[PDB]
Amino acid sequence: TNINYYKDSYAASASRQDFTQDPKKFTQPVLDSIRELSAPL
Amino acid sequence: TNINYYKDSYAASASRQDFTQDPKKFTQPVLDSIRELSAPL
Amino acid sequence: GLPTELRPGTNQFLTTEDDTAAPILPGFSPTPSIHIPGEVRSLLELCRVETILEVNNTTDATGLNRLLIPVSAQNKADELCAAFMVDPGRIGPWQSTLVGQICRYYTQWSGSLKVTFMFTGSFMATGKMLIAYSPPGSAQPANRETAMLGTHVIWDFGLQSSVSLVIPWISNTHFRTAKTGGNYDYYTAGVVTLWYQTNYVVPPETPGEAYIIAMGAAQDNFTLKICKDTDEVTQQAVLQ
Amino acid sequence: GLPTELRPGTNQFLTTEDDTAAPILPGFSPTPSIHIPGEVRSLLELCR
Amino acid sequence: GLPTELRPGTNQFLTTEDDTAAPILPGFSPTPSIHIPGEVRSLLELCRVETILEVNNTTDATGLNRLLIPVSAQNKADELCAAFMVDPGRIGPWQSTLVGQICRYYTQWSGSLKVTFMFTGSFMATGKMLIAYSPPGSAQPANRETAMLGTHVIWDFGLQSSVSLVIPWISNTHFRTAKTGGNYDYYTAGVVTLWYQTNYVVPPETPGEAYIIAMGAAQDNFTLKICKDTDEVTQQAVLQ
Amino acid sequence: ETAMLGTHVIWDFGLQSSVSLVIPWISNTHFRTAKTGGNYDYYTAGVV
Amino acid sequence: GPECFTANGADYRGTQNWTALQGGKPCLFWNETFQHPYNTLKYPNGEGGLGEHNYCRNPDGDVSPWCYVAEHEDGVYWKYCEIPACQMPGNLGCYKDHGNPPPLTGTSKTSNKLTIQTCISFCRSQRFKFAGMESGYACFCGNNPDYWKYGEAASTECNSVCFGDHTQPCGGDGRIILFDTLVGACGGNYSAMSSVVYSPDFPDTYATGRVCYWTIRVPGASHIHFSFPLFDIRDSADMVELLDGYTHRVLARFHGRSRPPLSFNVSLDFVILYFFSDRINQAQGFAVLYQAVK
Amino acid sequence: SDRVAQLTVGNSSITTQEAANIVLAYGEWPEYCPDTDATAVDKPTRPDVSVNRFYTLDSKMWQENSTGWYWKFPDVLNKTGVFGQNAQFHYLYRSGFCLHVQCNASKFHQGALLVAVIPEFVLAGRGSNTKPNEAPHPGFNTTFPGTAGASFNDPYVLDSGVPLSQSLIYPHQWINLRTNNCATIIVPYINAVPFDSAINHSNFGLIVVPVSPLKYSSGATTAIPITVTIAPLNSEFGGLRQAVSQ
Amino acid sequence: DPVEDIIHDALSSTVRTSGQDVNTAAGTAPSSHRLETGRVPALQAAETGATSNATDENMIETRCVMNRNGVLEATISHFFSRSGLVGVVNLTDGGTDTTGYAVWDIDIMGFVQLRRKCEMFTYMRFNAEFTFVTTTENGEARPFMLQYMYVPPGAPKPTGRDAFQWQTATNPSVFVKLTDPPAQVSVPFMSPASAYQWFYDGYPTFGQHPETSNTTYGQCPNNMMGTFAVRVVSRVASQLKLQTRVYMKLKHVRAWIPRPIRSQPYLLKNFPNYDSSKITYSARDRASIKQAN
Amino acid sequence: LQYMYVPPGAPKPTGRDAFQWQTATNPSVFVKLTDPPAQVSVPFMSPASA
Amino acid sequence: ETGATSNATDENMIETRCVMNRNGVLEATISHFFSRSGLVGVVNLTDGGTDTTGYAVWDIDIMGFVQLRRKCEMFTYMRFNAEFTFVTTTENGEARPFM
Amino acid sequence: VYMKLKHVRAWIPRPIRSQPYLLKNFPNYDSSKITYSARDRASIKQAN
Ligand SMILES: CCCCCCCCCCCCC/C=C/[C@H](O)[C@H](N)CO
Ligand SMILES: CCCCCCCCCCCCC/C=C/[C@H](O)[C@H](N)CO
Ligand SMILES: *[C@@H]1O[C@H](CO)[C@@H](O)[C@H](O)[C@H]1NC(C)=O
Ligand SMILES: *[C@@H]1O[C@H](CO)[C@@H](O)[C@H](O)[C@H]1NC(C)=O
Secondary structure, three states: OOOOOOOOOOOOOOOOOOOOOOHHHOOOOOOOOOOOOOOOO | OOOOOOOOOOOOOOOOOOOOOOHHHOOOOEOOOOOOOOOOO | OEEEEEOOOOOOEEOOOOOOOEEOOOOOOOOOOOOOOOOOOEOHHHHOOOEEOOOOOEOOOOOOHHHEEEEEOOOOOOOEEEEEEOOOOOOOHHHOOHHHHHHHOEOEEEOOEEEEEEEOOOOOOEEEEEEEEEOOOOOOOOOHHHHOOOOEEEEEOOOOOEEEEEEOOOOOOOOEEOOOOOOHHHHOOOEEEEEEEEEEEOOOOOOOEEEEEEEEEEOOOOEEOOEOOOOOOOOOOOOO | OOOEEEOOOOOOOOOOOOOOOEEOOOOOOOOOOOOOOOOOOOOHHHHO | OEEEOOOOOOOOEEOOOOOOOOOOOOOOOOOOOOOOOOOOOEOHHHHOOOEEOOOOOEOOOOOOHHHEEEEEOOOOOOOEEEEEEOOOOOOOHHHOOHHHHHHHOEOEEEOOEEEEEEEOOOOOOEEEEEEEEEOOOOOOOOOHHHHOOOOEEEEEOOOOOEEEEEEOOOOOOOOEEOOOOOOHHHHOOOEEEEEEEEEEEOOOOOOOEEEEEEEEEEOOOOEEOOEOOOOOOOOOOOOO | OOOOOOOOEOOOOOOOOOOOOOOOOOOOOOOOOOOOOOOHHHHOOOOO | OOOOOOOOOOOOOOOOOEOOOOOOOEOOOOOOOOOOOOOOOOOOOOOOOOOOOOOOEOOOOOOOOEEEOOOOOOOOOEEEOOOOOOOOOOEEEEEEOOOOOOOOOOOEEEOOOOOOHHHHHHHHHOOOOEOOEEOOOEEEOEOOOOHHHOOEOOOOOOEOEOOOOOOOEOEEOOEEEEEEOOOOOOOOOOOOOOOOOEOOOOOOOOOOOOOEEOOEEOOOOOEEEEEOOEEEOOOOOOEEEEEEOOOOOEEEEEEOOOOOOOEEEEOOOEEEEEEEOOOOOOOOEEEOOOEEEO | OOOOOEEOOOOOEEEOOOOOOOEEHHHOOOOOOOOOOOOOOEOOEOOOOOOOOOEEOOOEEEOOOOOOEEEEEOOOOOOOHHHHHHHOOEEEEEEEEEEEEEOOOOOOOEOEEEEEEEEOOOOOOOOOOOOHHHOOOOOHHHHOOOOOOOEOOOHHHOOOOOOHHHOOOOOEEEEEOOOEOEEEEEOOOOOOOOOEOOOOOEOEEEEEEOOOOOEOOOOOOOOEEEEEEEOEEEEEEEEEOOOOOO | OOOHHHHHHHHOOOOOOOOOOOOEOOOEOOOOOOOOOOOOOOOEOHHHOOOOOOOHHHOOOOOOEOOOOEOHHHEOOOOOOOOEEEEEOOEEEOOOOOOOEEEEEOOHHHOHHHHHHHOOEEEEEEEEEEEEOOOEOOOOOOOEEEEEEEEOOOOOOOOOOOOHHHHOOOOOEEEEEOOOOOEEEEEOOOOOOOOEEOOOEOOOOOOOOOOOOOOOOOOOOOOOOOEEEEEEOOOOOOOEEEOOEEEEEEEEEEEEEEOOOOOOOOOOOOOOOOOOOOOOOOOOOEOOOOOOO | OEEEOOOOOOOOOOOOOOHHHHOOOOOEEEOOOOOOOOOEEOOOOOOOOO | OOOOOOOOOHHHOOOEOOOOOOOOOHHHEOOOOOOOOEEOOOOOOOOOOOOOOOOOOOOOOHHHOHHHHHHHOOEEEEEEEEEEEOOOOOOOOEOOOOO | OEEEEEEEEEEEEOOOOOOOOOOOOOOOOOOOOOOOOOOOEOOOOOOO
């Protein structure tokens, strides 16, 4: 519904906000995806 | 028909006025809903 | 760009217009609400609940006793107990009820008004009372045989000590205005007057005086008009 | 915002234009009317 | 042209509005992007990763040792090892963790917080510890038999030297604010206190002191509110 | 204000001048014995 | 020296009649100002320096000296008066705060019943010789002598009330006050020349049975001249004793029944101020002032 | 057939024979915290019998020149009862009360009483001074009187600058000595937050005002008392911790 | 099944006033005389706290009126839709005042006419529409520019005219001219609580509370919501005495728990303190009881 | 300039610094003098029908 | 020690309850975290009698002022589009009829 | 001169700088005044 009065792309304000969160990139950046409630070692 | 030029909700003026009146909340806040023309006691 | 012209009525911060304004926190989620009782959605909702009148608003009646009319036995019959002007916006007893305070925020009012009268006397003491509403015209009547002619309700004591009178909405126009005096007394709504029907008959070893609590409200057809700054605030100093 | 330009003829309180103005009492219901005789709708009605 | 009027709120460079502006290079194609790891899309994504607290933020603890709490054997039992106020926005240890720095950019915060405690002692030295969170109210408790009553987690050493406590989000309101002091301490979130459960029992020919690293973060239900200029910058001179 | 804490019944006068309290059977055991005193007061049933 | 010893200006009876040195208001006399709550009709015999004048006093128990002035609809019916002379010895002034780095980079704490001496008891417990309040709840110790780095500010807007006691100021929000640690304590040695010896736990009431010995060892001073500007003792068992230092000998005695004189010369070089108190009933506090003249 | 009344909560069982008509504040029964709105992530506790009893406060005597009394809730119950020992050990709290007040008098006496709950019943310093640092303020024991319940000083403005004449917007019920010797109110949890502290935030007040003065011909009972029996419903508790008196 | 007492109440722990939408005024139907016992709507019992429902049809010989009077303007949504004064600032930028800035904490209780309206409802929830009118002390407009930064709780407050807080990389600010129509901004419901509270029967903190002077009483912070600062955009001072009023509107309002209207005059801002020496009686004093003017 | 409508019964202004100009209920028009003329629509606000 | 975050969820430690939360995470994303405008630079176009230049050149460096700097330091590589705004005034804050 | 950032896409989050800035294009701090992030407390077991 957001609208742009120019034929360029970079004159829009909030053209698509997005919910996308991936804690696995930083919080658990592990090879062996450990179990949620087990002993890691 | 009312329109908002922003993607937030709190920039509208009178987005939905409403007729909703409940005199029973305050005027007759009674357990035993008394009769309309009888003796209460 | 699009061609346009600015009509008159621009750049004016109108106090009561209804337009959008720039959101100050973009992309904001408020604190989610909670279901709370007592959600009022109208002020007519508050006009339909009773609040006491300061009908005994006299000099030499200070303190809490302004809310109570005295009632004593009358050796001579055909006696006048009390009376008050029904006009809510007008000064007088209705300054102490809510429906008279909230009416002052608006200019015009319509719809029937009702008043109850709780008796606080002893259980054994009994008596009859006549509650007479007089439409406008002349002043309050002299004797009860002149106050009959308006709509009146006769009251008997006993259990269930609160009778209800309802002043019917009678008026030439569709709306009376709250201001009264000068030429605005053309919108006067009469006077309610309460008379001793028979007496306040008391048994022995019982106090020979009592009190009535005059509670007033608005009937379901109460409707109001444009807004108005009230009169009960005259702030002089800025609050520091 | 939308691009635009102000043409001439702006800021002029024309006595006979026909535009909207800000309502002063928002959400107002008037006193309901009444059927009154003699409702004239034209001045040619009075020339006859 | 089209008739129109300028409402109030015009010609105002609002810092946080969201409108179009004239493109400066008409018909421009940017440098095409490249797939780069570490693409963050939220700041809550950064609150869920641990960073060390400067819990030993005392005079006579300067250098790197601010990040470490000492742990030694106690000849007398029922001893208090350390404690700190859990409030992130408040000054204190949480100024050194990210979740306390990033919370300062916002006003209000909610959601459970969690802290881990890595033990750095020798392999043979073992010991039990009690980690007690106390909700608000009185100050930090005097003895551990008064600090039991809050939610507490008991910790045993061995392999896997990092236990996890999670401070549950308990509060009358839905959001506490970062500022604390005066009347804003109504939003205080209690105090975490760590107690010697039994002792720091050491074998012979082993150092009789050790350290714990207190790492803190935010639980998955961490949510934040309107923005705020932080407090950790007071630039005086313009950078030349 | 110390005797509130047990089961209590509040009584108003008027007509029907006989209220009823019922002492509920509360006891550690299944049966109290009639003898009371010494060590048999372990089977005491309180006070009205 | 100062015309004022206590941190509010109660004993201040100065000649100032204005409300400020810069932009001062001509203050109205106490004997026509009767619509305002303080005047001279219902206050006979001068409760708090009240008489036929317009000098700023403190008869209400407030945090500052003040008076009553009218306005051209751009003022309030009173005004706090700024007096540069009533800064008690032990007050380093009030200064404006900025944030980071703080001027006092010692230890910082926060309470909710913080009076003044609770911080001075705290910086003394950590051997930081300067203290700092922030708006009645926050403590700020530190040994730094560069507290003046941000700028000197007037002592009028530095007067937000303490949460502990509601009769003395604890600075402002973003404005610091600085009290030394030698005051509000006892003991130690005074090798300085003309410093000021205050009660234990000043400004608060001394605690239950505060017994302690001051030490004034001055090199080569001919005579020591004491004074008693503020000396209010209520119970008799609470005493003050001026002892000799070499032989531990009694020279003078004052308590709640023997009122103090103005001053008297104590002509020796090593004197001891002894203090002993009772457990039951307490009193406001005492302040003295020694002058080593060679 | 309507004058009798039997309310029984917990091990208690109250009865009143002359008073009639239970008034329920705002038409909503007291209910537990719903799942979709609570914030206290830990499990709260539901004793439901030990605490939900009819605790009886102290008797306040009514004289012919009396002014009024008032209480605060749940402040009246923090030293007594298991509910007291439960509120001192928990930071969070939610409950809904069943007020009930009694004033017995003979059929020869006269008088009336205004009974009303007052949500968020703050009080007001009684003084013309507007100096911000020297402003008159009510003391702690005046605003949190405890189990006893203090008296008014000027009831016509409720000691808050609000006229008593308008005080019937709140849920109320009149005791009047000709027809009813007692009154009762069932009030839900009224608070802008789902839970609150119990020894800091009082949810509401209660007022018992002698509007019509007690008047009796000489030769009768002169000492008329007033007792209030109170009973929480659907109580909650969360965030266990050490004791806290105040 | 193991014990009935635990499954009985849990099954019966379910949820325990379907008012209609009234578009117009309430009409009335006729009514004739009715001479019968047992049925009486007058003799109610106001002592139960209920409102008497003695309708007009049930008392007198009424008529048939199909009313049309609109109730639109009486709802709370359009009752608070009016904007109103909130505060004034005094940005006295001159030679003597070497500050160049003026900070004002938001308190709508400072002015009575808007205060007395919101006192009628104990808990409110709304979104605001602030409006910053701008002028000099003489009412004159001038060619100058102003900055209007909102400083939330916890933010660093400005210190002077050249302060770094005016960089406002996070704090929302309004840059506006003085030859401009008034700036207008919408503001959301930014409480930490779920609803605003004009009253608080207690204290923010725990611990002791004295009885000699209780300055922390009745001060909930959930409504206390930070400060709002202004300067002229300039590093050297221009000599002008400025005074900008600030106005707000209330929209999307939702009230709760109606409260009576305050009759006594206000004396303080955050405390509803009246004076015992001058009790302003609500009703005007009449001559005698039976002398309705 | 400020342009407040004062209905019948409202408190009339008393001076320049009057409290009635707080206008929390009375409709007011705040407008500049270097402005095109202010223009406002007004409804039929009689207590009568005509 | 493995560098992972501990996943000790609240349900797995204490006797929790059922909460269907509703708190919005919209305002915490990076898109609305940098949406605020902020100061970048100042120029000093001292056009007078002494300064016979009449122009002032300023190289774009957002690092010059701290409050915007410290925000973008949190992310090492960024990609965005900008919305510049050139407020205009004199040293006295006065506006004048010039171009 | 003011700027806004829109359509932002970040990568590789970096810790927040605590030390004060001294230069423009170089993150140079001062060894003589290390600004410790956390405020200094009294002792370890004295949470304010
Ligand atoms: C840059 C924009 C400036 C305008 C923004 C200022 C913040 C406005 C927040 C409004 C908060 C609710 C209204 C405040 C009411 C009272 O001040 C408090 N409830 C208590 O006094
Ligand atoms: C006529 C239009 C004038 C405005 C156009 C000026 C050019 C703006 C280009 C913006 C480039 C990205 C933002 C710059 C950031 C920093 O200066 C550099 N990254 C390094 O210091
Ligand atoms: C102040 O100083 C003295 C009296 O204290 C007097 O000569 C002088 O006129 C006074 N000024 C005013 C303005 O009262
Ligand atoms: C009031 O005090 C002033 C200042 O001392 C004096 O000039 C004046 O005469 C006094 N007036 C009266 C009535 O005592």
